[PDB]
Design goal:
Keywords: Taste-modifying protein. Heterodimer of an A chain and a B chain. InterPro entries: Cystatin_sf, Monellin, Monellin_A, Monellin_A_sf. Helices cover 19% and strands 30% of the residues. It is of the alpha+beta class. It has one domain: Roll (Nuclear Transport Factor 2, Chain: A). Strands 1-2-3-4-5 form a 5-stranded antiparallel beta sheet, with helices on one face. Strand 3 and strand 4 form a beta hairpin. The longest helix has 17 residues. 25% of the residues are buried.
Length: 91
């Protein structure tokens, strides 16, 4: 597999969107999903390397209005992962 962090730039703008989407789509439409900031946001995928893509997931450990942890997210690709996310693994 692979792994790589970001620079409080892209995963940040995503934390607000994705979260409110998968967070609400997951059944957590309580409120928005972005307030404080995104610093320890990381990305990790379980794909091949130069022949195909198997699973693309990510870890967004940060803090928003009620996300004191990491908004995770996975996405099937060639094996059969899936679309989802998680709000835990707090600090």
């Amino acid at each position: 597999g692979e792994w790589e962090i970001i620079d409080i730039g892209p995963f940040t703008q995503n934390l607000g969107k994705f979260a409110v989407d998968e967070e609400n789509k997951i059944g957590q439409y309580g409120r928005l999903t972005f307030n404080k900031v995104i610093r320890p946001c990381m990305k990790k995928t379980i794909y091949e390397n130069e022949r195909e893509i198997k699973g693309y997931e990510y870890q967004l450990y940060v803090y928003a209005s009620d996300k004191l942890f990491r908004a995770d997210i996975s996405e099937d690709y060639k094996t059969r992962g899936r679309k989802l996310l998680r709000f835990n693994g707090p600090v």
